[PDB]
Design an enzyme around this catalytic site. Structure first.
Site, PDB file in Angstrom:
ATOM      1  N   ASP B 349       0.885  -1.140   0.000  1.00 38.03           N
ATOM      2  CA  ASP B 349       0.000   0.000   0.000  1.00 38.03           C
ATOM      3  C   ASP B 349       0.950   1.223   0.000  1.00 38.03           C
ATOM      4  O   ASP B 349       2.043   1.158   0.631  1.00 38.03           O
ATOM      5  CB  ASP B 349      -0.962   0.073   1.193  1.00 38.03           C
ATOM      6  CG  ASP B 349      -1.764   1.345   1.401  1.00 38.03           C
ATOM      7  OD1 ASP B 349      -2.621   1.706   0.482  1.00 38.03           O
ATOM      8  OD2 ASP B 349      -1.684   2.088   2.399  1.00 38.03           O
ATOM      9  N   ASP B 694      -7.126  -1.933   2.820  1.00 35.89           N
ATOM     10  CA  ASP B 694      -6.249  -3.090   2.718  1.00 35.89           C
ATOM     11  C   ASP B 694      -6.750  -4.287   3.521  1.00 35.89           C
ATOM     12  O   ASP B 694      -6.073  -5.319   3.549  1.00 35.89           O
ATOM     13  CB  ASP B 694      -4.835  -2.718   3.176  1.00 35.89           C
ATOM     14  CG  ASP B 694      -4.302  -1.487   2.472  1.00 35.89           C
ATOM     15  OD1 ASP B 694      -4.540  -1.347   1.255  1.00 35.89           O
ATOM     16  OD2 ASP B 694      -3.647  -0.658   3.138  1.00 35.89           O
TER      17      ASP B 694
END
Ligand SMILES: C[C@H]1O[C@@H](O[C@H]2[C@@H](O)C[C@H](O[C@H]3[C@@H](O)C[C@H](O[C@H]4CC[C@@]5(C)[C@H](CC[C@@H]6[C@@H]5C[C@@H](O)[C@]5(C)[C@@H](C7=CC(=O)OC7)CC[C@]65O)C4)O[C@@H]3C)O[C@@H]2C)C[C@H](O)[C@@H]1O
Ligand SMILES: *[C@@H]1O[C@H](CO)[C@@H](O[C@@H]2O[C@H](CO)[C@@H](O)[C@H](O)[C@H]2NC(C)=O)[C@H](O)[C@H]1NC(C)=O
Ligand SMILES: *[C@@H]1O[C@H](CO)[C@@H](O[C@@H]2O[C@H](CO)[C@@H](O)[C@H](O)[C@H]2NC(C)=O)[C@H](O)[C@H]1NC(C)=O
Ligand SMILES: CC(C)CCC[C@@H](C)[C@H]1CC[C@H]2[C@@H]3CC=C4C[C@@H](O)CC[C@]4(C)[C@H]3CC[C@]12C
Ligand SMILES: CC(C)CCC[C@@H](C)[C@H]1CC[C@H]2[C@@H]3CC=C4C[C@@H](O)CC[C@]4(C)[C@H]3CC[C@]12C
Ligand SMILES: CC(C)CCC[C@@H](C)[C@H]1CC[C@H]2[C@@H]3CC=C4C[C@@H](O)CC[C@]4(C)[C@H]3CC[C@]12C
Ligand SMILES: *[C@@H]1O[C@H](CO)[C@@H](O)[C@H](O)[C@H]1NC(C)=O
Ligand SMILES: [Mg+2]
Ligand SMILES: [Mg+2]
Ligand code: NA
Lengths: 291, 996, 32
Positions: B349, B694
């Site tokens: 990420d 996420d």
């Protein structure tokens, strides 16, 4: 994924043919070398031991005391009438005494007449091979009175009041030493204390000792034991066809239809015992003549 | 019918925000200025559930305990224990005085599984016990307007369709619909992934409900300004609610280590049943009945089961997990410790994981020259030249013309990680001045502010005026800042080293190119300027009120541009490089703007310097982008908007023909599709994140790594590993340990699997040659669960034979934990020599005691009998029952010692897989102690008072201890030359056939 | 008599060696 059996690009059971041959050849050479190495070391091991004496003899320190009817549980249960009930016993007794007949001990070059009276030990030199094949003292079945007979091929033994002979475990170089004349309460026995290994049977508790009425022992010249003139043993290689001493025991006054325990304890200084091995020195039996 | 429920969650969310204020007021039926009545409030609150995510699914402690009592390795020992009681059932009811060996072993196998379950369970539960100490749930309150009155209630007491107001600093309670904004800037970082503080406007801006500005979001924080809105979504029906519930309902998968263990058990039982069956049939062919042959079959198969290997592998993994906990790297799963090493694709990420998720002063433009600043979180980088007049000017333009200060407790906290109120940009500038330019307390109060002009709604500029305390000039000081376009339109003078110059285009174009350089780099630039006020036209008493033109807007003196951006974390670039150095495909997955994602990707290593995208080539050739061949572009940026219109085959192609991929503007539900796309190739995936977007990614991936503090709670709980210190280098540490523990695991396996041959061969030739039993049952237990425990565990402490961070990641189809070469080594060659070495000592003891080996054939028949007290040897001696059994047990004891002696050499040759013992070095003190403990323990099990009684392990004559020395040395020499030929011949015969 | 093995000598010696080999390994894992 489990059909890797074959393909058009050569694979069998997982690998090709040339690979199967390479691996098989390698394993054959490898395992062949391993076998040769194990054989060579085992040969050196064979070179570290002699033919006339075992290196270690401490695991047989107290000799055993076996009997002729090798029962499944040291129990003698049969019927005084049914001949097939006691067939398993008589068969083993005859097969055991098959090597003690007068015809078996006929060669004078390997047999030596010890004597009708138990004498001192017979040491035939050292245990090496410098001397020829040693002689073995004879032991005719006549010594075991009332439990030998002059029967035919089948030794008609005792149906009522059975016979149970005892045998001392054959040990190489073992010299039996009977107890001193200062016998520490050894259950009435004859005064032939110096040249015979005494063996006395008895019950096991206040019940067994009472059920067993009378016992009659038979041995060389009439002594309940093993004569010292037959010891020591010089191995099977130097003394083949050796006949260790025997001594019979008959239980005359038994309580029929009752299982009673008998403990035949061999006495002596060189005779040990064991609370774990009921056969080292002593010997047990469960007789039951059920009619 | 829960499949449809999960499918309706994997889809991107829809909304109805794009409505007029009157239409919204009609749909929800609520006053837009007074709100709703508290009666209606409680009426809904008791109608659909409070505004709070339904708790996670509670996991009772007895469930996960029973869970540790099963699995792959434990189930094998269970079928083994059941087979023990089965064989014992066949042995008890059918024969006289049955031997209690089988039952005695069955209870032990069961105890092995139970004790292993207790240890492993206490470990995995301890990892969650320290996790419950990280939930600092501070119940916060919300500001709801009801019945025309503002009130602060609990966030769970909020309902649907009620007016809500937020203050700069508050956290947005539920998902609102912005109806009245005023300088509102919210932080959608943890949700959609937008890095810079996104503003919120009441007007409908974008068809997508996430990118638009008229929607306030759950768990988002209001950075600055005030705003009103109507609660559209509540509870779990929220955005992050529809994401959290999706993460809680996804699959975990199968860890690679678990697959290797399963396949290992497949081979173990594959050969176990093969030998047991071929020998069962062979036994029936010989003489034994079905009754005896069944017992033999069960014995041969069960004996081929490594009993102690379970605990040794569990501890083998727990030890490596300890080093993880020391470096602040918690693993909730006891096997996820290995997954980092077997990884080949990392989906990271950007915001929060790769970057610091904090606006920081990037570069400067002093003296017509770019100056990079230290953008590290811990401040450990190169510093810019800070001893010039342009610096003393610009630093004061920042230290005075800024609406940002510190707070109460911010006194002992570090310079950067301290709380600051105001704009993110102003906070970053305040930090850079508070650090590279002394302090701002006295530097700000030294110049008494007179008049200030805040930022405008159009033509954003912030200016102010201050007194001058310099003991050289009593004039005034006017300062101004703003977008680089607002300062270029109101300036004519330029500062250089202390003096001024005109706005000559020769250097003004030099300013424009410097603006486009810092602009195209994904940074946000600001301009700072100041001008002296003549004390003869504005004396020290004239209060220029904030009404009309009082200050010279033009003819100002520009000092320099100051750009800013969220910088990547400290060791992130180096770590990404290390991952790529091992062969791990790094793929950035974020939902931020591509303009910033591509820049940070270039700044961290996901985009190599030199490689171009499909767009970069077109920009370089001034040609349409649809002409170039995508094969010429090694790297590619994927706009999430285009990802919505794609198929599986297309994404497969995106990953097959492009090595450097950067996914931008991807929704949380799209990250799941991306992870699944990387998994459709057959590779191992590790997703590293922090925000709630996420959560489904960190759940579906083979291993999810969440940030310990700068990450939300949903994704952190749904992850498999947590970086408690947010140090991304722990990823490199993890992949190193994963490959390390993998190879060391193979070594420990080959060790325990080598001892099986000398443990079973005595019972095999016991049936074939009919010799007395050479090796007992209890002695085998003393080997598998006694001596070999410390060696197997010590083998896990071995270090790297070569550089593991250099070789490529393992292939799941080729590189197996237990290949057929390992079995050919342990079960094939080594264990075979050990078995022969044991039979040697066996024949030695028996032949020396009078039973020559040639005479031992067919002797077990009467030897095992309990009443035949006149068995003849080779010398004619008559042995009783206990007298010969004593020799058998005192023959099992040296066989056990023999196994220990050969295991010495086996442990040393297993310490090195490819190297030499001389090359590597006996420095494993755990292994040294393993040898000494193994030896002293074996000696204690033979010479202790009562061993011949408790375990029948009678004492040994000293000559027995040397009967195994040649076989041990032989094994050592043969394996050493094997590892030597593999060294000089890297070809493959000695390698591809034995090197495991 | 050769039918006796001084088992106590070897047993006691093996115990002393078992104790020494253990404490030596302990000192080995205590590098200090
Ligand atoms: C009907 C006639 O029966 C006549 O009695 C006979 C018959 O009943 C037949 C009867 O055979 C037995 C006997 O020879 C003993 C013989 O005993 C062997 C097999 C059973 C064992 C209990 C025993 C001790 C080691 C033990 C096995 C069982 C295995 O599963 C192990 C646990 C295995 C391990 C697995 C592992 O995970 O680690 C190690 C390796 C070997 C093992 O350690 C050896 O197993 C054989 C099956 O011997 C009796 C004396 C009497 C009259 O003549 C009557 O007229
Ligand atoms: C061996 O058995 C015979 C019987 O066949 C026993 O002979 C008897 O002995 C008693 C004296 O104890 C006499 O009263 C009987 O008249 C004898 N009967 C016969 C038929 O001879 C003999 O005593 C037994 N031998 C031993 C040593 O007990
Ligand atoms: C042999 O044993 C029997 C017992 O079976 C003895 O005879 C018993 O003597 C008791 C008195 O003590 C009587 O009550 C029984 O009626 C007798 N039974 C029989 C069958 O006579 C006998 O004395 C023993 N004989 C020897 C020589 O020991
Ligand atoms: C009691 C006796 C008769 C059993 C005899 C078993 C022997 C002959 C068997 C047991 C294990 C076998 C080996 C097992 C492992 C390997 C590797 C494999 O990829 C090819 C077969 C090969 C090379 C085998 C050769 C033959 C072998 C050594
Ligand atoms: C090529 C070379 C190194 C191999 C030479 C083989 C040596 C190492 C082997 C061959 C035969 C072995 C001996 C065989 C006989 C005895 C007596 C026995 O009761 C104890 C083992 C002992 C003491 C062995 C010790 C090691 C030994 C001498
Ligand atoms: C390969 C080498 C370096 C390993 C060193 C350890 C060897 C030399 C040690 C380990 C165990 C030792 C034995 C331990 C037990 C016994 C019984 C004792 O009452 C006499 C010593 C004797 C017979 C030892 C002989 C030497 C021995 C075999
Ligand atoms: C033992 O003592 C008795 C008398 O108590 C005696 O008659 C006998 O001869 C002695 N035997 C030996 C061997 O001394
Ligand atoms: Mg994030
Ligand atoms: Mg085992
Ligand atoms: Na998972």
């Amino acid at each position: 994924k489990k059909f890797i059996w074959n393909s058009e690009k050569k694979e069998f059971l997982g690998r090709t043919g040339g690979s199967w041959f390479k691996i098989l050849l390698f394993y054959v050479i490898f395992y062949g070398c391993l076998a040769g190495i194990f054989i060579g070391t085992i040969q050196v091991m064979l070179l570290t031991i002699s033919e006339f004496k075992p290196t270690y003899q401490d695991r047989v320190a107290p000799p055993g005391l076996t009997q002729i009817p090798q029962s499944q549980k040291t129990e003698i249960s049969f019927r005084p009438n049914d001949p097939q009930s006691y067939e398993s016993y008589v068969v083993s007794i005859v097969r055991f005494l098959e090597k003690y007949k007068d015809l078996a001990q006929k060669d004078d070059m390997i047999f030596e007449d010890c004597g009708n009276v138990p004498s001192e030990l017979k040491e035939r030199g050292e245990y090496n091979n410098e001397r020829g094949e040693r002689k073995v003292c004879r032991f005719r079945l006549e010594w075991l009175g009332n439990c030998s007979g002059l029967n035919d091929e089948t030794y008609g033994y005792k149906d009522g009041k059975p016979c149970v002979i005892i045998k001392l475990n054959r040990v190489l170089g073992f010299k039996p030493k009977p107890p001193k004349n200062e016998s520490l309460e050894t259950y009435p026995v004859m005064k032939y204390n110096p040249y015979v290994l005494p063996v006395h049977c008895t019950g096991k508790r206040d019940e067994d000792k009472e059920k067993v009425g009378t016992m009659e022992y038979f041995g060389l010249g009439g002594y309940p034991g093993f004569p010292l003139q037959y010891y020591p043993y010089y191995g099977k290689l130097l003394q083949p066809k050796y006949l260790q001493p025997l001594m019979a025991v008959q239980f005359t006054n038994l309580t029929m239809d009752t299982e009673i325990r008998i403990e035949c304890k061999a006495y002596g200084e060189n005779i040990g015992y064991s609370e774990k091995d009921r056969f080292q020195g002593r010997f047990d039996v469960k007789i039951e003549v059920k009619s | 019918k829960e499949r449809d429920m999960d499918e309706l969650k994997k889809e991107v969310s829809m909304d109805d925000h794009k409505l007029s204020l009157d239409e919204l007021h009609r749909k929800y039926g609520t006053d837009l200025s007074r709100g709703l009545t508290p009666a209606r409030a409680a009426e809904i609150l008791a109608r659909d559930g409070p505004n709070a995510l339904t708790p996670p699914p509670t996991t009772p402690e007895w469930v996960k305990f029973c869970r540790q009592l099963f699995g792959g390795f434990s189930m094998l020992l269970w079928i083994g224990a059941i087979l023990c009681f089965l064989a014992y059932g066949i042995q008890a009811a059918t024969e006289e005085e049955p031997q209690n060996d089988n039952l005695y072993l069955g209870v032990v196998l069961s105890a092995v599984v139970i004790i292993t379950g207790c240890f492993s369970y206490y470990q995995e539960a301890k990892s969650s016990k320290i996790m419950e100490s990280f939930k600092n749930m501070v119940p916060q309150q919300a500001l709801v307007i009801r019945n025309g009155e503002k009130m602060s209630i609990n966030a769970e007491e909020v309902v649907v369709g009620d007016l809500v107001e937020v203050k700069g600093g508050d956290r947005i309670p539920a998902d609102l619909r912005i109806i009245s904004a005023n300088g509102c800037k919210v932080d959608n970082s943890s949700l959609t992934g937008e890095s810079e503080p996104q503003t919120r406007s009441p007007d409908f801006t974008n068809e997508n409900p996430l990118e638009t500005r008229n929607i306030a979001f759950f768990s988002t924080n209001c950075v600055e300004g005030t705003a009103r809105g109507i609660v559209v979504y509540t509870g779990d029906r929220t955005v992050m609610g529809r994401i959290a519930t999706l993460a809680s309902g996804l699959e975990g998968g199968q860890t690679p280590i678990a697959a290797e263990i399963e396949h290992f058990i497949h081979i173990i039982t594959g050969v176990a049943v093969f030998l047991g069956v071929s020998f069962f049939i062979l036994s029936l062919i010989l003489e034994y009945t079905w009754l005896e042959a069944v017992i033999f079959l069960i014995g041969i198969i069960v004996a081929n089961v490594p009993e102690g290997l379970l605990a040794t592998v569990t501890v083998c993994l727990t030890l490596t997990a300890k080093r993880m906990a020391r470096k602040n790297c918690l693993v909730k799963n006891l096997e996820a410790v290995e997954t980092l090493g077997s990884t080949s694709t990392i989906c990271s990420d950007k915001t929060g994981t790769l970057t610091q998720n904090r606006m920081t002063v990037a570069h400067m433009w002093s003296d017509n020259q770019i100056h990079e600043a230290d953008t590290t979180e811990n401040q450990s980088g190169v510093s810019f030249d800070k001893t010039s007049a342009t610096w003393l000017a610009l630093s004061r333009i920042a230290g005075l013309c800024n609406r940002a200060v510190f707070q109460a407790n911010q006194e002992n906290l570090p310079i950067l990680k301290r709380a600051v109120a105001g704009d993110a940009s102003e906070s970053a500038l305040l930090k850079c001045i508070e650090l590279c330019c002394g302090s701002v307390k006295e530097m700000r109060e030294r110049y008494t502010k007179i008049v200030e002009i805040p930022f405008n709604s159009t033509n954003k500029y912030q200016l102010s005026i201050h007194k001058n305390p310099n003991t050289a000039e009593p004039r005034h000081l006017l300062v101004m800042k703003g977008a680089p376009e607002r300062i270029l339109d109101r300036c004519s003078s330029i500062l250089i080293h202390g003096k001024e110059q005109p706005l000559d285009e020769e250097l003004k174009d030099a300013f424009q190119n410097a603006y486009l350089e810092l602009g195209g780099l994904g940074e946000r630039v600001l301009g700072f300027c100041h001008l002296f006020l003549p004390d003869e036209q504005f004396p020290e008493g004239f209060q220029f009120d904030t009404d009309d033109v009082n200050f010279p807007l033009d003819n100002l003196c520009f000092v320099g541009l100051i750009s800013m951006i969220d910088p990547p974390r400290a060791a992130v670039p180096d770590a990404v490089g290390k991952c790529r150095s091992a062969g791990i495909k790094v793929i950035m997955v974020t939902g931020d703007h591509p303009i910033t994602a591509k820049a940070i990707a270039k700044g961290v290593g996901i985009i190599s310097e030199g490689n171009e995208t499909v767009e970069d080539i077109a920009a370089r050739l001034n040609i349409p982008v649809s002409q170039v061949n995508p094969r010429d572009a090694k790297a590619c940026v994927v706009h999430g908007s285009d990802l919505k219109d794609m198929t599986s085959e297309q994404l497969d192609d995106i990953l097959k023909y492009h090595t450097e991929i950067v996914f931008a503007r991807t929704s949380p539900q799209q990250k799941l599709i991306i992870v699944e796309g990387c998994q459709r190739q057959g590779a191992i995936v590790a997703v590293t994140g922090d925000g709630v977007n996420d959560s489904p990614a960190s759940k579906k991936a083979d291993i999810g790594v969440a940030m310990g503090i700068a990450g939300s709670d949903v994704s952190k709980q749904a992850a498999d590993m947590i970086l408690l210190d947010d140090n991304f280098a722990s990823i490199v540490t993890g992949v190193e340990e994963g490959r390390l523990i993998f190879d060391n695991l193979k070594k420990s396996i080959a060790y325990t699997l080598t001892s099986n041959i000398p443990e079973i061969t005595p019972f095999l030739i016991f049936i074939i040659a009919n010799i007395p039993l050479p090796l007992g049952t209890v002695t085998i237990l003393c080997i598998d669960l006694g001596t070999d425990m410390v060696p197997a565990i010590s083998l896990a402490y071995e270090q790297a034979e070569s550089d593991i961070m250099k070789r490529q990641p393992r292939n799941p189809k080729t590189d197996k934990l237990v290949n057929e070469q390992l079995i050919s080594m342990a079960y094939g060659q080594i264990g075979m020599i050990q078995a022969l070495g044991g039979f040697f000592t066996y024949f030695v003891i028996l032949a020396e005691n009078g039973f020559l080996p040639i005479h031992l054939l067919g002797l077990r028949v009467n030897w095992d009998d309990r009443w035949i007290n006149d068995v003849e040897d080779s010398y004619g001696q008559q042995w009783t029952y206990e007298q010969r059994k004593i020799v058998e047990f005192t023959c099992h004891t040296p066989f056990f010692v023999t196994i220990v002696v050969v295991q010495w050499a086996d442990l040393v040759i297993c310490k090195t897989r490819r190297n030499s013992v001389f090359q590597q070095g006996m420095k494993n003190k755990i292994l040294i102690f393993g040898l000494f403990e193994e030896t002293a323990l074996a000696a204690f099990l033979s010479y202790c008072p009562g061993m011949g009684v408790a375990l029948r392990m009678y004492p040994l004559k000293p000559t027995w201890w040397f009967c195994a020395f040649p076989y041990s040395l032989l094994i050592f020499v043969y394996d050493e030359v094997r590892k030597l030929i593999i060294r000089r011949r890297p070809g493959g015969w000695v390698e591809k056939e034995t090197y495991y | 008599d050769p039918f006796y093995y001084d088992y106590e000598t070897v047993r006691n010696g093996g115990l002393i060696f078992a104790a020494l080999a253990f404490i030596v390994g302990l000192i080995i894992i205590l590098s200090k």
